[PDB]
Every structure is written in C-alpha cells, then in structure tokens.
Amino acid sequence: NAQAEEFKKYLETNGIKPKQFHKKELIFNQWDPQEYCIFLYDGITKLTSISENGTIMNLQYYKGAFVIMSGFIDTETSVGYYNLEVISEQATAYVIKINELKELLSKNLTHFFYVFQTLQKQVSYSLAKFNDFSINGKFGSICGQLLILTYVYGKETPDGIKITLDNLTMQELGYSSGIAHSSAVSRIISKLKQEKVIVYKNSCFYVQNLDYLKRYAPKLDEWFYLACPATWGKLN
Amino acid sequence: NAQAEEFKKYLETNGIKPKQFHKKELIFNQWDPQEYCIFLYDGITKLTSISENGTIMNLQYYKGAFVIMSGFIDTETSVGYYNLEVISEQATAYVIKINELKELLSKNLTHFFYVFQTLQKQVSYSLAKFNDFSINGKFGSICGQLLILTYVYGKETPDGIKITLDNLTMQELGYSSGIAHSSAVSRIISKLKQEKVIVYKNSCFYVQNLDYLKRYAPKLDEWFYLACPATWGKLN
DNA sequence: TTGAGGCATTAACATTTGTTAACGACGATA
DNA sequence: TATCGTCGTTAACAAATGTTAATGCCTCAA
Structure with a gap:
C-alpha cells in the first residue's frame, strides 16, 4: 500500500527503527501492559485474549501493513488486555511509545488521517463480524x-x-x-x-x-x- | 463530559446548527447511502441493520455525547449499511457532511484527538463485546x-x-x-x-x-x- | 360492558451445540 | 523396527438453543 510506505519512511526519518519478531512471539501481552502503538509493516499476527480459567479467544488477525494500539492517545491508558502473537515465520513491526506518536502526527496531517483511516477500518470490521457471528x-x-x-x-x-x-x-x-x-x-x-x-x-x-x-x-x-x-x- | 462541550462550541463557531430528532425516526439508514459524521450530544440511539430476509440485528447503543461515522474520512465511502434509530423521546445531534469534516479537524487538532479517542473507545468496546458474547x-x-x-x-x-x-x-x-x-x-x-x-x-x-x-x-x-x-x- | 391485538410466560418438540471418549492416521524419536 | 504423542474423525450422550403453539395479563377503542 502506498499510504503505508509514506508512513514507513516518516518513522525511519524520525529515528524509529524496525524490530524483528519470529513465530510464537508476543509483541505485547495481557500481563505486561505497556501502552504501545504497533505499525505491523510485514507479517501476519493474531490478537488473542485468555480468560482466568484458561479459555483462548482469537479476536482477529492482522496482515501488514496495519496499525494496532494497546493504549489511548490523550489519556495514554490501556485500551484492554490482549496479546498480539506472531503466527508467520517472522514479521517486521515498528514499535513506538504511545506518547511519542502524539508529536509525529501533530506536524504531518496526511499521516494522521491515514492512522484514522485504518482505525475506521477496524470499527466497521468488528461490527460486520459481530453481525454475522451473532445471527x-x-x-x-x-x-x-x-x-x-x-x-x-x-x-x-x-x-x-x-x-x-x-x-x-x-x-x-x-x-x-x-x-x-x-x-x-x-x-x-x-x-x-x-x-x-x-x-x-x-x-x-x-x-x-x-x-x-x-x-x-x-x-x-x-x-x-x-x-x-x-x-x-x-x-x- | 468537558472534552465534548469544548467540541460542541467548536461546531457552532463554524456554522453547524444542531438538528433535533424525535423518537422512532432514523438519522441515517441503510437503504439511503449518505456519508456523514454525526455528533450525538443528547439522547439515546441504537445502531441496527436489517438482513435481506427481514432479520434484525441491534449492534449496540449510543448515548450522547458520542461520535458516529457513516463514511470514511479519506475515501468518503460508507463504512457500512446500518441504521441509527432514535429510541429516546427526543435527541439532538450535530450532523456534519463528511466532506466538510476532514477540513474541520485539520484546523484544531485538540478536537481531532477527541474524535480520535472516541474511535479507540469504539474499537475496544467492539472487541470486548465480541469476546464475551462468543465464549x-x-x-x-x-x-x-x-x-x-x-x-x-x-x-x-x-x-x-x-x-x-x-x-x-x-x-x-x-x-x-x-x-x-x-x-x-x-x-x-x-x-x-x-x-x-x-x-x-x-x-x-x-x-x-x-x-x-x-x-x-x-x-x-x-x-x-x-x-x-x-x-x-x-x-x- | 365486550372484544381485538400485543406482550410475557410456559410448554413440547426439533435442531444445534457442549462434552467426553474411542479409533485410526501421521509424524518424530531411539 | 517399535513406540510414543498430536490431530482429525466419529460416536454417544447431555445441555443449550431454535421453533411453534397455547395460555393468561394487560391496554386500547367502541
């Protein structure tokens, strides 16, 4: 995706480097909640949760490029306790602190509406999925x-x-x-x-x-x- | 609470008049596709969708202040064919043309963060509800x-x-x-x-x-x- | 006063799904 | 070569849900 490429270089230019993960690896998890914003660029992952009695729940998958955030922007508090597990051989994601992000999009708007675009995809995706599963x-x-x-x-x-x-x-x-x-x-x-x-x-x-x-x-x-x-x- | 009232006056300042609604009438429906960005300020509403064979699905409820979007900010296409039915006796909402939207956030980004975090609150809610309704x-x-x-x-x-x-x-x-x-x-x-x-x-x-x-x-x-x-x- | 329609309750019967176990296939290890 | 563990079927039975019908309570309208 072109939109995702302009966003890639925008991060490498600001001192952010890619981090490499392999299969079975958890970028973030439900027990060590640091408020991140993950720009999964290459690879495929699954978002999961685990109940207190050991029940597993795969909420969805993520094929890069896509944006996932474990914390709000203004309050910078956790949005929920989930695990982002890598399921391909390896994946490449740009991990950034939740507070760091605020400043980047404060200068570049075209990269702002891009993150807003993907989050709009997320919403409509959950509603449509909740619709067909519940029927x-x-x-x-x-x-x-x-x-x-x-x-x-x-x-x-x-x-x-x-x-x-x-x-x-x-x-x-x-x-x-x-x-x-x-x-x-x-x-x-x-x-x-x-x-x-x-x-x-x-x-x-x-x-x-x-x-x-x-x-x-x-x-x-x-x-x-x-x-x-x-x-x-x-x-x- | 206050983050919304601050956003309330930001709309009146740009010439966006509140449109009042009464119970049982729909703001945007599935059949007529128009992309807007509603800012429900007072009242109760439910998001619904009618299947091809009349089957009904209530997706969730909304209570002002809150934001709902029937289209994408970048492509201006509809996020999905849904209906927003007013179930309270009276509800007031600032309906906005989605084309006029992107140009209104680029000015003040503090209200951009506001509309942004509400989306984050929507995503998390959708995931949490999907998790519990499925187990x-x-x-x-x-x-x-x-x-x-x-x-x-x-x-x-x-x-x-x-x-x-x-x-x-x-x-x-x-x-x-x-x-x-x-x-x-x-x-x-x-x-x-x-x-x-x-x-x-x-x-x-x-x-x-x-x-x-x-x-x-x-x-x-x-x-x-x-x-x-x-x-x-x-x-x- | 009577009577019609809508909602809640419960039944009963069918269908789906939860649950556990047994079987056999396939791979990996020594 | 034998043996172990993992995963896919299938059975069998319990529990939950789909489905329809009947009953009773309630309001509304004449």
Whole structure:
C-alpha cells in the first residue's frame, strides 16, 4: 500500500527503527501492559485474549501493513488486555511509545488521517463480524471466519481457493469462533464437506462454493467490498 | 463530559446548527447511502441493520455525547449499511457532511484527538463485546448485554439497580444478542431471576447480583473500568 | 360492558451445540 | 523396527438453543 510506505519512511526519518519478531512471539501481552502503538509493516499476527480459567479467544488477525494500539492517545491508558502473537515465520513491526506518536502526527496531517483511516477500518470490521457471528450461531461463525481467511490468504487454485495459512488446526478455528472443543468444529466442517462447500487436503482448506459462505456472512462480504475493494475484487 | 462541550462550541463557531430528532425516526439508514459524521450530544440511539430476509440485528447503543461515522474520512465511502434509530423521546445531534469534516479537524487538532479517542473507545468496546458474547453462547450474550445496560442506564434503588430504559422488551433484548424468538430470551431470563440475580418489576429490570454478570462478561466489565471509569465507579 | 391485538410466560418438540471418549492416521524419536 | 504423542474423525450422550403453539395479563377503542 502506498499510504503505508509514506508512513514507513516518516518513522525511519524520525529515528524509529524496525524490530524483528519470529513465530510464537508476543509483541505485547495481557500481563505486561505497556501502552504501545504497533505499525505491523510485514507479517501476519493474531490478537488473542485468555480468560482466568484458561479459555483462548482469537479476536482477529492482522496482515501488514496495519496499525494496532494497546493504549489511548490523550489519556495514554490501556485500551484492554490482549496479546498480539506472531503466527508467520517472522514479521517486521515498528514499535513506538504511545506518547511519542502524539508529536509525529501533530506536524504531518496526511499521516494522521491515514492512522484514522485504518482505525475506521477496524470499527466497521468488528461490527460486520459481530453481525454475522451473532445471527446464525456457531455454524455461521465458522462460515464467517473462513470467508475472511479467503479474501486475505486465499489463492485461486485448480481445485478451489486455497487458504495459504500455516498450521490452521481445528483448535485455531474454534478459538476464533468461541468454540472450545475441536470435535465441534470437525462436525461443523463435516457438514461443509458433505455439502462440498469445502474440501480438506494436505492439512489445508480449499473453498468451492464461496457464495454459500456469503449467505451466512453478508455484512462481512459487504465490508470487504466497501473497506478493502482491492482484495475483495480478486474473487468476484 | 468537558472534552465534548469544548467540541460542541467548536461546531457552532463554524456554522453547524444542531438538528433535533424525535423518537422512532432514523438519522441515517441503510437503504439511503449518505456519508456523514454525526455528533450525538443528547439522547439515546441504537445502531441496527436489517438482513435481506427481514432479520434484525441491534449492534449496540449510543448515548450522547458520542461520535458516529457513516463514511470514511479519506475515501468518503460508507463504512457500512446500518441504521441509527432514535429510541429516546427526543435527541439532538450535530450532523456534519463528511466532506466538510476532514477540513474541520485539520484546523484544531485538540478536537481531532477527541474524535480520535472516541474511535479507540469504539474499537475496544467492539472487541470486548465480541469476546464475551462468543465464549458462553447466548446465555452469556444476554448477561453481557444486561451488564452494559446497567452501567450506562443504572440508578441504585433499595430493590436493586434500576435499568432506566423504555421498552427493553424481550424481543428488543434478543435483537442485541442475536436471538430471533422472544420465547428463547424469556426462557433465559426465567433462569436469571430463578438464580436471584435479577427480577422483573413494573415491566422494568432490577439487577441484584452484578458480580454474576461480571463472571459471564469479564472483558466488558474491565472495558468500563479502562474506558469510561466514571460510569464504572458509580456501581463499584 | 365486550372484544381485538400485543406482550410475557410456559410448554413440547426439533435442531444445534457442549462434552467426553474411542479409533485410526501421521509424524518424530531411539 | 517399535513406540510414543498430536490431530482429525466419529460416536454417544447431555445441555443449550431454535421453533411453534397455547395460555393468561394487560391496554386500547367502541
């Protein structure tokens, strides 16, 4: 993205350097809350939370370039206790103090409205996701997450659309939907295989009937059209 | 509180007159797409969306002062097709043309930070609500929604905390959690006053065991602590 | 006074999902 | 080569939710 490149150099010019992270690494976490602003430039990560009794919840994923902030700007207090785990081999993010940011955008407005732009994407993304998950229960929640993982990591293949995401276990699909038992997602998936909406091959997933998912995730598909026109138009 | 009143007068200074609204009439709807940036100053509203087959989804509630945007600041396209229904008897809001918006923040950046932090409060709220509504299914969803309503619309009484909302009919509660039939939500509420955490009096709700809700909505409870701490202190 | 419609309550029956266990496949290690 | 642990199915049963209908309370209108 061009907007994200102008923002990159704007930080390197102000003394900010990139930090390298590897898989399984947590940029920030829910136990050591330092108010950061992370400009994930290259890589993919998952935002997660862990209840007091050990339940995992994958709130969403983040494919760079994108902006995530663990603290407010004015008050500079925590916005919540979440973990930003790296799931690709390695990722490159520009970690900056929450107070440092205030001054940078105070001089450059075009970089201000860019951060405001991504946060607007965040909002509309959560509402659309909350909409489709809350309607058709769990079966619709799986159909919804898969639709998200195909407009981002989906590549047109001979037999369907392959989700190029490493180690997408059954557990990982459950944490994203609130399901805690892998036997429940397999059952939901077995229904999508008998309906041949999805086929399972080489520990990966290939989508055949993308419209079936759209029926259970209309507001989300609508979001990819309104918020990320590029990535959306690749499969329509 | 004060951060908004300061932003109130900044609009009148630039020639933005408040437009008053009355109950049951929509500011912006899903069918007619116009991008604005509403600054609700007084009154109660709910954000809604109607599925293709008439299914309704209440996404969340809004109480002035607060900001809502039906479009993007950079691309001026709609964030999504939603409806903002006024459910209070009367509500006043400063509707602004989104094109006129970006030019109004570039002048004073202290009000840019204000509108910015409200977005951060929206993102965190969306994540927290998504977290709790997904772990414990529908029963937790109702618990979560009720907890939200107690903090925002709660006044202590000798019989419990009074949820000062008109309507809040069985059907209106299910719309927020994602339940279609009023008998399903009544079955759940039957279990809550069975366990003696709430009671139905005067077609209105008195919650008597707030902590029971905190156990099913832990993320939402801490959101109020970190985001709106004044509201949190009124019941803690 | 009667009667119509809307809401809450409960039933009952179907469907979905939570939960645990057993089975078999696949890889890794010695 | 045998053996161990991880993950995907599948079964089986319990719990929760979807769904529809009936009943009773309440207001409104004539």
